[PDB]
Amino acid sequence: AKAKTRSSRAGLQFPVGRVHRLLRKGNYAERVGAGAPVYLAAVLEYLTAEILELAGNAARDNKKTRIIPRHLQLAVRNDEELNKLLGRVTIAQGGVLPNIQSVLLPK
Amino acid sequence: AKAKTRSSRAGLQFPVGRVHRLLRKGNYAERVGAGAPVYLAAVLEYLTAEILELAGNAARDNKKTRIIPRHLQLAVRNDEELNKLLGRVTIAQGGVLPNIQSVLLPK
Amino acid sequence: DGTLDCISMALTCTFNRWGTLLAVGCNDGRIVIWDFLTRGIAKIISAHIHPVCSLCWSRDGHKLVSASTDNIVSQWDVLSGDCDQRFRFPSPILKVQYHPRDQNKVLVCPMKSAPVMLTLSDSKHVVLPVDDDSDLNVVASFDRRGEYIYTGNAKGKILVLKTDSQDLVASFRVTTGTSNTTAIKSIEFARKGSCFLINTADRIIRVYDGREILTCGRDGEPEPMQKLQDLVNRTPWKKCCFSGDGEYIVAGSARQHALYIWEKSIGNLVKILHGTRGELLLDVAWHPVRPIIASISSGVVSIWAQNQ
Amino acid sequence: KPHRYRPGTVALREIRRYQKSTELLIRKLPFQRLVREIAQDFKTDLRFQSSAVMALQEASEAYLVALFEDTNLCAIHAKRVTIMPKDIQLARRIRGER
Amino acid sequence: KPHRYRPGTVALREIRRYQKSTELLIRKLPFQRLVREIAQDFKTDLRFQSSAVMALQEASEAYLVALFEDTNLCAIHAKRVTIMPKDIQLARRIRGER
Amino acid sequence: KPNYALKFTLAGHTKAVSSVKFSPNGEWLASSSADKLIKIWGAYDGKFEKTISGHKLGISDVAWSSDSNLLVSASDDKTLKIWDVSSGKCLKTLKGHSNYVFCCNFNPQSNLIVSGSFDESVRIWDVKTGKCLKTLPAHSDPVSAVHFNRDGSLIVSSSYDGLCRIWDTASGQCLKTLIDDDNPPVSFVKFSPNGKYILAATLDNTLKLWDYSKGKCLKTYTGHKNEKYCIFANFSVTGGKWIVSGSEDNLVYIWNLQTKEIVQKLQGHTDVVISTACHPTENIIASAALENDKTIKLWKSDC
Amino acid sequence: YRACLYERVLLALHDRAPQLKISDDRLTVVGEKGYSMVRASHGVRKGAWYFEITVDEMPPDTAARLGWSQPLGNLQAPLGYDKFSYSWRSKKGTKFHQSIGKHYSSGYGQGDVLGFYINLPEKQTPHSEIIFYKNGVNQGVAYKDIFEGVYFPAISLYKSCTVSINFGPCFKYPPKDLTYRPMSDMGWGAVVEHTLADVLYHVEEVDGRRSPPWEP
Amino acid sequence: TRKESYAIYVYKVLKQVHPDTGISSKAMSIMNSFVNDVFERIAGEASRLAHYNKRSTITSREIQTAVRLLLPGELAKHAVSEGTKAVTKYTSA
Amino acid sequence: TRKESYAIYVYKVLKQVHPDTGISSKAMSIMNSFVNDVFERIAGEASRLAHYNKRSTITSREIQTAVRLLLPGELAKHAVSEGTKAVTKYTSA
Amino acid sequence: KVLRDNIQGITKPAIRRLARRGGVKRISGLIYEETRGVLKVFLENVIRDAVTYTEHAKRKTVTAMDVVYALKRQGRTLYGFG
Amino acid sequence: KVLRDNIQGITKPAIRRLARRGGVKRISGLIYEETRGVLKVFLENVIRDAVTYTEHAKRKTVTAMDVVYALKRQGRTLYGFG
Amino acid sequence: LPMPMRFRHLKKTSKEAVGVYRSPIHGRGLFCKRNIDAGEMVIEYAGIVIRSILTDKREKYYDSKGIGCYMFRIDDSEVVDATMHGNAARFINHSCEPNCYSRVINIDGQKHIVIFAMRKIYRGEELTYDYKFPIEDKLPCNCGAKKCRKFLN
DNA sequence: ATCGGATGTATATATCTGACACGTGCCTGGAGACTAGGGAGTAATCCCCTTGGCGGTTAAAACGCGGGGGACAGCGCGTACGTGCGTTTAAGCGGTGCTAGAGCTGTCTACGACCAATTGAGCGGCCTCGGCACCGGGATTCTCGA
DNA sequence: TCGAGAATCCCGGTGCCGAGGCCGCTCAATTGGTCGTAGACAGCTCTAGCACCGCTTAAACGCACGTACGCGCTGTCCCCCGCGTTTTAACCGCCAAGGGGATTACTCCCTAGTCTCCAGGCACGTGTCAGATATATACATCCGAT
């Protein structure tokens, strides 16, 4: 009996075994549903895809292959729903997305 | 088979057995420290004492036997430590403590 | 608060034992001994062609030790003005100091070399020890009675020797708070009691009681009686001195030509005196038995009294 | 001759009595209708507890008086006794509500 | 004749390059000494990770630029380009920091 | 008790003598009078040393220097005059008192002068430049006597208005004002040798020793007669502790210092014994009488 | 303003000697050496009025004196040493004035609650008099000859005397006269009068002054 | 359906502090909700810490530490004392 | 010490979306911390709602509901659809 | 029974009453509707999240404990409702 | 080794650098020390709470994960440190 | 500004704000050396604070000594007697048109009689206030004012 | 700055009551007693990060130094907002009545729990090399006086 | 306003180490039984919600109107920006000691889990007074004339 990872049968990239391990070790319920780690890991993969895509957009806009935290912070403050999700979150080497106020301009 | 509850064994009021069952059903840790319910319930006893005491202070300050939630709001807004404890907390029928800004007064 | 037009090129001054006369050095290298009561010059001595940067009275007041910028030290009788003795060294002299209880002896702090204690009777000299052997800048001073010698290096190390044997009777290094040393700018003592002060490169004056250093022993952690500074401007101190009694301390802000006055016990700032914003503050001294303070700035002396 | 109190004075006393009072200052039924209108947007024909909607209105009004409060404060920093929409907007901005 | 840019202009470019840059703007050692000074208040002779203190300073500076940001915004609502302490205080007030 | 006997009688002032003072070394006796003349005499033999003139009007007071080298002369010409006692040279002439100068005294360090005048203002003077450094509306009546404390920190002043006022020297601050329940015209005042007490004569045949720290009269001395003239009082210390003074009855009164009782009455003067001086070292007392006597008498006792 | 640090009209602390101690538990007054004098807050200028003194301690070497005194009364003197003070010595009832003692009086008791009646008109002041009572019982007239000038009730202490002044609404044996006024009444009368004095002096700020038909 | 609460206990401690002062049911349920909230606060915090310690057991030391984290200054101090008292009183059982 | 992370799966899904891109290890750690954050968020919310439902079993319905509670609009919609498709795929075998 | 426009059912007198409670003296008109919007936006979240709870609750009526856990999750917790 | 007064070790140039990063043109002096205070106050919490963690950690050195969980509990979470 | 703070400022600036010179009013008097604004503290009439009952005993005392009485009524209970101990305020002449006015202030429980400026007083001006002396039976006034009562009393 | 009048507000009173304190019978969670395992605690070991110091540099901080720029104070006006009084209006009481849906019990069953046997996906560790960071230099563009 | 000058952008070239790729080397993931049980679901209540409708009225909307703060503009001061210089200590690189952090291996104290019994808690009735409410009253305070 060959052993394949459950994420393969889920066709995903993040290790659902490690997921369910953290789940049981997380003291959330007496017994975790079978497909619940699968579902949440799928959500995780999707959102990671979104954020990494935004980051790659920013970096290539800046003509950069290696993506520095600044790109990610900029994308964060560029996605309104993601920002809402993460506005309460602080970002190392984030800096501030360029924001210029009106009355600040000269004449 | 002499009976004596752990609250009496601590000479306190909050139900050590009940809160122990509660934390057990709360799924936070596999095993528990038997004295942790005692300790926490004692802390609750203390803080409850202070807050109800300030509440009653406002109450008889208003000739009020039965304490009103407005007394509670005033109490929690007066004490710095308790206010800090419950800053982002809201209270039903709370209202706002008396506060008029300086420039609000006409000269 | 009162200046003197009759003297020019004021560079360094020194009160006599009773605060009756003031010997001020001039750029021409002359001693102008000016009197407080008659409010006039009492004597003019052709000391050096080189300006005088260090001046000290004798206990009897009949002798004054002077140091030229030509590395020329000379003793002069105040009545006659003759050069009683004259010596010269390498590493130009930073300071001279009569021994308070033996005017025959005088300590000398040179620029690059260790301070040496000479006698006038015999032209001998005793080189005082140096802890780190590489300070090249150590200020030194007798205590109030001349029983011990306090030497502070550019590396915050403080040695207390006995004046006769030069033996290390106490030691400790002052700190910049965190872990660092600071250049000991100067060591001053009180003419009354045992409290003394240290001016350091951190612009922070540290007041101690020498008995506490003596009981602290060698290589100890003696805390200061007081810590004094301009927390507002963070100003260096070109020259500081106690009061005559020893309960008031003054510092000269040459950065802005001002004078800060704190207490000893509490340490709170008594007051501030503001001089000419264009004057560069150079020298500071207190009347030993009066609330009178002499200041030398841009070659001009000013007097600051305090009335009832 | 008819008397009229100087401006604000009546409103000042209103402030005083409102900090004195503690009950709600919103009519129940309009608030409830608004809540149900909002509800049908996400799903239609949903029922509610009177306790639930009382909680909604109380918590709302609390947030609202807090907003009015700190916007008053900001307007103090704006050196005005009149309120400006920008005050509310920037308050939410500092409140992370933007 | 000597040239001097008009006020703010140089500071404006500084703003531009700082929004351009991302690294820290605080000298490491002073911040670290401050942290250890604060630490000895609660308990003396406690050690730290360089990573830990780097996190401290980064997170601080983040909170600090956020405070500067929304206080700038408030000062816009204050119709001034100069900052006033009351702006910061009331900002914390809206930030629930009072 | 003293046994002062007349040893030398001195005279020569053409007018009423106003003051006689022993030199601090006890070598000379300076006698001032209204004749615009001062007379230095030998303090042990009654030998007339010399006469120093130069003042334009009558002289109301003269005071020695501490080193026995200078003499300040306060004259009715509204002027002081500082003289070298050895050369008799008018080293300085102090102008600025608007009326008759009546008293004058050096500081304990001899470098400063206090002066009282009819102008009812006390002037404070330099010695080496002779410059008036301070001027105080001290009293509401012409000043009678001014004097320094032991060190020169305090200046006591008396005047005809009956006030005895202690003033700060460095500031002119009116430190104290001694009152004795009445307004007795105080014609003389001076500090105690220890600077702890003050002897003041009032023009009612009464002398009063006050404590300075207490501000109250400690002792009183009567039996003499003094109601119009500036009769001087001195502390006899070279022998027993006594209080010596003149009197309008031609007597030279000597009371015990502590018991306040008269310990001697030197008679032989024919006019009011106007001025008195006690020797600093010996038991010698110079008593000078007024114009109906014009004589100064040396008295020597054995204790 | 002349605001007085007093809940009721009491013995004014502004007019006591430095050797005069008070206990506000009974507002009693006591001393240590010799005699001294204290006075009340109020002062009579016209009409008839009445107060009391309650004695709480009278050892043999303890003799208080109680009466009235006009200003010019040196508060170190024993309340009757001058001609402006008229008191009673609390050893035997003896009227003391000009330091002169007169036995035209009754006898005093150690625990006497003594009533003090005094009537000044609106060179003796016409029809003015002083009457002394022992617990309301008439001890008799003390002084008919009363000089001009305002008077105030005063207490003199000898070595460690304990006595206290007391007003009318808490009295023990009060006269039922409708004209006499307690201590508190004249007290607030004088307080209001001095309030108006401040008013009028600050007015004298504005040009002009004007007062009604003089009689009152 | 039995619904547990602490109105009994809050009333007990009320009397223990104020036998005279009464209580309203509204404020009663307020107290109950509040204590539930703060108990969940301390529970989550202590569990988080122990997870950091990776210790599957939750003991009193965790409670002390986490309430110290929770309470503003002196409260905690006071608090911990009685807590200690409690366990002492219970360890002395 | 065996420490577990997800940066390998980060690189995987990156290549899945951007094959020609590199990352800063710093950014990888940031993203992994973000993963942990969202995971604890969703887990806590699910446990809390199950507690409200008194459920001791956290299943995919809880997952979807809690995501909807957390994610906004089309984010939530797409995430729900994706989790649904994935659990369908896994349940298909 | 399709509802609408109850937002303006919020009376300007009600708004100014709340403002006076907040200690406000002078107010402009432009606020109220703006205010209303915010109000809406604010509640815009909670009810949804609340019914989201009710979503998982599989129930047709909405309860207080829903908004309790919402305000909790919204960091604006409230007391007095279990 | 007792430390002190490193708060003023924060240079005004550093403060204005941070301000320019925040996009600020004109600044007053009164801010900086005030600023500093806030800074202190801010960190005043975290370190303590952090060492509180270290308190329960029973360790002498302080780690990043401490401040991580603090800022988390302080609702100011940060990434990039495990 | 606080009456204590204002009083500290007044006692700090009094020595350099005013002077005493020969006066055309009479003898010597107080002149302004630096422009004084209206209502601001000009000078304290500092002296010996005594009770009222002790006034006469002092006055007669001075009457026995021929020394003039320098006393100002603080109130019905206190008086600042500056006869023997005072300050420069003993040289403030009177004018029927005063640019100054006396007021009693309470600092830390003690009363101070401060002459404030009725108007903006400029440098060189002689300082005068209303003594408000009651009408006697006569001191002629030479204040120079056109409204001068010809008599203080 | 005051007084008079208007008005609004704190008080005492009376009674009504419905929450509310109080007591019950009955239930089950808590206590009490007993068993196991194994998380926790202790200890010896290793490592190794940290904390300490030392010397040279300069970019950075301190400090000074005009000086234009705006903070601010004041000053006119006017429009927008309190207010008190009108008006009309839904809000609230309340009470009715239906049931849809919570809300409860009773199954039974699929479903992880769990353990055991198996291992390859993944992770620490080791090369490696190329975007990337730095640098120098040239060309571009903003800005401040015409 | 067209140049001078200055800060910047970009280009080529240099050298590097982190990003990455691959390699041993597991333990944690998978697989497969097996079991007790969470809840899925059905099937009942009942009640709280939902709507109906009427009656009263406090409340809401709008008006008119004074008015007064918002706003807009001017001139001043001072003061913070910009640049120049001087001083310094952060940094950086290296070294070194040890002290704590992490590890592993035992060891066992304590807690989970079980079973028993009951007693405190809880739903449920039950009088009953704290206070809600209304009213007349006495006090406080604004607003305008003086």
Residue numbers in the entry:
A (entry chain M), B (entry chain I): 12 to 118
C (entry chain A): 18 to 325
D (entry chain K), E (entry chain G): 37 to 134
F (entry chain B): 32 to 334
G (entry chain D): 279 to 400, 440 to 521, 523 to 534
H (entry chain J), I (entry chain N): 29 to 121
J (entry chain L), K (entry chain H): 20 to 101
L (entry chain C): 3814 to 3950, 3954 to 3969
Give passages from the manuscript.
The mixed-lineage leukemia (MLL) family of histone methyltransferases (HMTs) catalyzes the deposition of histone H3 lysine 4 methylation (H3K4me) associated with active transcription. We and others have previously shown that these core components are essential for MLL1 catalytic activity on histone H327–29. Compared to the well-studied WDR5, RbBP5, and ASH2LSPRY proteins, the function of DPY30 and the extended intrinsically disordered regions (IDRs) of ASH2L in the MLL1 complex remains a mystery. By combined NMR, SAXS, cryo-EM and biochemical approaches, we find that DPY30 functions through the extended IDRs of ASH2L to restrict the rotational dynamics of the MLL1 complex on the NCP, thereby promoting H3K4 methylation at higher methylation states.
To understand the molecular mechanism by which DPY30 regulates MLL1 activity on the NCP, we determined the single-particle cryo-EM structure of the human recombinant MLL1RWSA complex (4-MLL1), containing four of the five core proteins, i.e. RbBP5 (aa 1–538); WDR5 (aa 22–334); MLL1SET (aa 3762–3969); and ASH2LΔSDI (aa 1–504), bound to the NCP (4-MLL1-NCP). After several rounds of heterogeneous refinement using cryoSPARC57, we isolated four different subclasses of 4-MLL1-NCP (Class01, 02, 03, and 05). In the end, we obtained three different subclasses of 4-MLL1-NCP structures (Class 01, 02, and 05). In comparison to the MLL1RWSAD-NCP complex (or 5-MLL1-NCP), the 4-MLL1-NCP complexes displayed much higher dynamics at the ASH2L-NCP interface. While the majority of the 5-MLL1-NCP complexes anchored on the NCP with RbBP5 and ASH2L at DNA SHL 1.5 and 7, respectively, the 4-MLL1-NCP complex adopted multiple modes of interaction. With RbBP5 anchoring near SHL 1.5, ASH2L binding sites varied from SHL 7 to SHL 4.5 among different subclasses. The cryo-EM structure of the 4-MLL1-NCP complex shows significant rotational dynamics on the NCP as compared to the 5-MLL1-NCP, 5-MLL3-NCP or ySET1-NCP complexes. In this scenario, the MLL1SET domain has to go through multiple spatial arrangements to optimally engage both H3 substrates in the NCP, which negatively affect MLL1 processivity.
